[PDB]
Write a protein that binds this ligand. Structure first.
Ligand code: HEM
Ligand SMILES: [Ca+2]
Ligand SMILES: [Ca+2]
Length: 329
């Protein structure tokens, strides 16, 4: 079909997304960048969609975290979901689509801004949220591996699918894990969608950045990087360790699995055959910047290998001496 300004798309219903793309790129993503706002909106897709259980209830990706912010925003697990929700609300009100659609749309666009990023399939027509999500549906970093895999399993995800989704921590920081150091990223290149997250979580920890005693934090191998307790355990648990390691220096797999599982996540509580494919609206991501590497000063011996069938790949270390990682601006 051909839309108002001559831009085209497969299905005419998708035309409404064009002016919304333009607005959010300029006014939410600070000029189509891969910074905080993108990170924040990516997180939001999860906090929305994961509110779904065949036993416990919840409408999955339905925008209920926005429509029922008052309730959900005040779940312990949704700490710091405030700003994101409050930031997207004017766009939701102003524009032409449901909150469920907007949350996933912005997330997908946001990802497409990150170097090494991938186009996430996007479908239109989620109806307004019916009710709030029930409590206890959002995984926390201090949840054990069994609790995390059970919850994600209950939502519809296998163990390997969890690992694939955690590629999101490649473009991610923390504000509330250690409040003393807001904006501390989970890997060295928070503005690039790459495998550094899967590499650097496998390294032997060295120190606590910021303060030493926080719920859901373990020692990080790098100053200016934070390691979630959960990610640390997932890189090493027999259920997830080998798949985790398989992501290392494997950009095409990372892109493929992330796009596939994100689309599955975005469809939680929904029906693909009852939506319109609006995937061609999603822009083309910039190519990957940089190659897989150990941090400077590090070597293979600093990797705590935990995949029983397959050894950790050979990676070189960055030229020079050990160094920190700036908080996310
Ligand atoms: C599976 C268990 C998971 C746990 C326990 C977990 C935990 C966390 C925690 C504690 C933070 C920091 C929040 C803060 O203190 O500010 C965070 C950030 C983030 N999470 Fe995860 N997460 C999980 C899975 C996921 C998934 C499936 C996605 C999918 C998109 C995701 C996307 C993000 C992003 C993009 C950020 C960065 C937010 C920012 O930098 O502003 N996470 N996560
Ligand atoms: Ca929801
Ligand atoms: Ca990265």
């Amino acid at each position: 079909a051909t839309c108002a300004d001559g831009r085209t798309t497969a299905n005419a219903a998708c035309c409404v997304l064009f002016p919304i793309l333009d607005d959010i790129q300029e006014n939410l993503f600070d000029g189509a960048q891969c910074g905080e706002e993108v990170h924040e909106s990516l997180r939001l897709t999860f906090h929305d969609a994961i509110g779904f259980s065949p036993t416990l209830g919840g409408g999955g990706a339905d925008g209920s975290i926005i429509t029922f912010d008052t309730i959900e925003t005040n779940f312990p697990a949704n700490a710091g979901i405030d700003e994101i929700v409050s930031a997207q609300k004017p766009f939701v009100a102003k524009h032409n689509i449901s909150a469920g659609d907007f949350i996933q749309f912005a997330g997908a666009v946001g990802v497409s801004n990150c170097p090494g990023g991938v186009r996430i399939p996007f479908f239109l027509g989620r109806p307004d949220a019916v009710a709030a999500s029930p409590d206890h549906l959002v995984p926390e970093p201090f949840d054990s591996v069994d609790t995390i895999l059970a919850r994600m399993g209950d939502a519809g995800f296998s163990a390997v699918e969890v690992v694939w989704l955690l590629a999101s921590h490649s473009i991610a920081a923390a504000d509330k894990v250690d409040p003393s150091i807001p904006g501390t990223p989970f890997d060295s290149t928070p503005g690039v969608f790459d495998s550094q997250f899967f590499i650097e979580t496998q390294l032997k920890g060295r120190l606590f950045p910021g303060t030493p005693d926080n719920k859901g934090e373990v020692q990080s191998p790098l100053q200016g990087e934070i390691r979630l307790q959960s990610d640390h355990l997932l890189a090493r648990d027999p259920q997830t360790a080998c798949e985790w390691q398989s992501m290392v220096n494997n950009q095409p797999k990372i892109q493929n699995r992330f796009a596939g599982t994100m689309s599955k996540m975005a469809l939680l509580g929904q029906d693909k055959s009852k939506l319109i494919d609006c995937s061609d609206i999603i822009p083309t991501p910039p190519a990957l910047v940089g190659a897989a590497h150990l941090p400077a000063g590090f070597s293979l011996s600093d990797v705590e290998q935990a995949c029983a069938e397959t050894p950790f790949p050979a990676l070189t270390a960055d030229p020079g001496p050990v160094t920190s990682v700036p908080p996310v601006p």
